[PDB]
Symmetry: T
Subunit: 68 residues, 12 copies
């Protein structure tokens, strides 16, 4: 037989930067999901409070292997 994958979309956030947002988001996914394989960034965004980046926001597609 042959594997099928599922691709969900999440947004990781961090006040520090793009990498921390990515990893922040993936950690929350890892808490409940198994067989996480890859991610792809869809967009990089952020919210500004008093002229400053309050949160970096990285929208990601996340691929994991489907269990039966």
């Amino acid at each position: 037989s042959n594997h099928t994958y599922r691709v969900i979309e999440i947004v990781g956030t961090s006040p520090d930067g793009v990498d921390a947002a990515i990893q922040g988001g993936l950690a929350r996914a890892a808490q409940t999901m198994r067989a996480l394989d890859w991610f792809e960034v869809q967009s990089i965004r952020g919210h500004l409070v008093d002229g400053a980046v309050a949160h970096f926001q990285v929208c990601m597609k996340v691929g994991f292997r489907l269990e039966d």
Copy 2:
């Protein structure tokens, strides 16, 4: 950093128009989902019957804050 969002995709439908289709799709999401925050229209389509629009169909991405 801590907050993570989930982005699901739905198609709202209505015979009345684009707004009606958007609000009908979102309304079904609100029956089961919590902390809904935003939507984005991916496309606007429709099925035609008797040379007129039977249903407007608006495809939407919908973001909500993930609970623990």
Copy 3:
């Protein structure tokens, strides 16, 4: 089994997006048969006196080809 044709039109209306969509499809319906679906390609409009004179909705329209 069936082959479909996809043509591109622009429906316009001073009232809004729905009316523009419908205005355009109705003109298509006058001459074309077996119209099945549509997809909006863009939503534009012409402005006069700083207000929307016409909403213009570019659509692709799919209909089943006859023999």
Copy 4:
């Protein structure tokens, strides 16, 4: 001689729908700008409060003729 146009980007908002957001945004532009000619929609979005569309948000490119 021959005309040049300027293309700015705005987001109109309304709690009623897409058309009202478009027109809401264009009215604010008209208050200060002259020779407004066309617009194109870049995206349709919205903010959700208690499962409901609080504001429809329509990001638009707006073209106007440049004065000298």
Copy 5:
């Protein structure tokens, strides 16, 4: 009212080609999902081993009718 569709994203795989990969992914979705209506290919990819295609990988959006 009038239906709302849910649109999920999966990746079908097969060593045999694009069709088999497509039918492979959908067969896994059909094991657990009801009222599957349509699919759209997002991309066609593959992993290569020793200079030959090990698996075709077809990423699909898949739309089904939501139950209450």
Copy 6:
């Protein structure tokens, strides 16, 4: 110093696959049109009947040389 080409859009269909759907569409185009030169796939879609692919649907742009 001369020729102009026309580009029309069709959707070929077939229960057998992507290739069959491509050829099925082009064959209909070949019944009436002359000097067909190239095609380009715009999208691969399909309708699902109780979990299986009923019809593969391949949307194509088809280019042909215009006669005077």
Copy 7:
């Protein structure tokens, strides 16, 4: 008014350049079509012979107002 427009797709060609390719195609559309209003360039392509550009090929969408 509440006019409807038709958008067709053509490829104008010329050995001289992009401009010449655009007007070559539009002239051919102008031989049969009425109320031509606008064009939009989709792509700029060409064919190479002996390491030179034999023909510039400009693919255009051409919008015209439908008569009754």
Copy 8:
């Protein structure tokens, strides 16, 4: 620090072609803007009158170095 660039969008027009339209728009921008560095074409369009191109219209993003 290190510079920030501003990126504006204009439409150059000319009855003569794409180059002249491009140079036309930039000449108007250069009348009032300083430290113009680059441009990128977004689209090439035109208005048609009596079956012929009245004006070429080239939409450009234009980047200049911000002063303090």
Copy 9:
């Protein structure tokens, strides 16, 4: 309804990285603009000198609420 936003485009730059480029561009915007609300990265580019990155350059759309 009433609130309207403006979306300008800027390129932040830094020799240090992507985050640094983002924050430097936004910082220049905050010196003169008020009620900044969000940004979106349009692209990530850079200039190379001596076979290394002299400056990271992140192109950003930046939205702010229009005052009366």
Copy 10:
């Protein structure tokens, strides 16, 4: 590790179909290139003769790991 990959672009062709076109091109890349890892389909095109598909043409990006 901290490997770097090279992505090249090829068009595989076959009169038989899409799958056959993909593997035709990959086999030619496999005749000279080492550590081929993945491909992504960019477009599916073809040439028409006598109203039939003479050659399926699949444009692919092909990623391989750079050696030292």
Copy 11:
């Protein structure tokens, strides 16, 4: 039942225009490469010196038949 094509990317430049920039790039490609078949413009850009276009820059994809 055979040929494979290679697709490389170059940027032709010229102070005279888009066409000249296209031909200038292809001529360099013609100096070393054989069986050049087509090109496609990816983007039209340019560098500005004190308000005027210094160099038009046309990025192209260039396709040629691979020899054995």
Copy 12:
């Protein structure tokens, strides 16, 4: 006057996006001359044990062609 070549590479790094970008350009710099610019095409990564094993940044890299 000058013609440029645009190649596509993927720089990787377990540390982040910048390090991935730089890791990739450095490998390019080992063999290529007159490297002038880069553009990021995508940011991806491989996951192991539910954490980022490698950040992968696909880039187009422009360099001036010699004669």
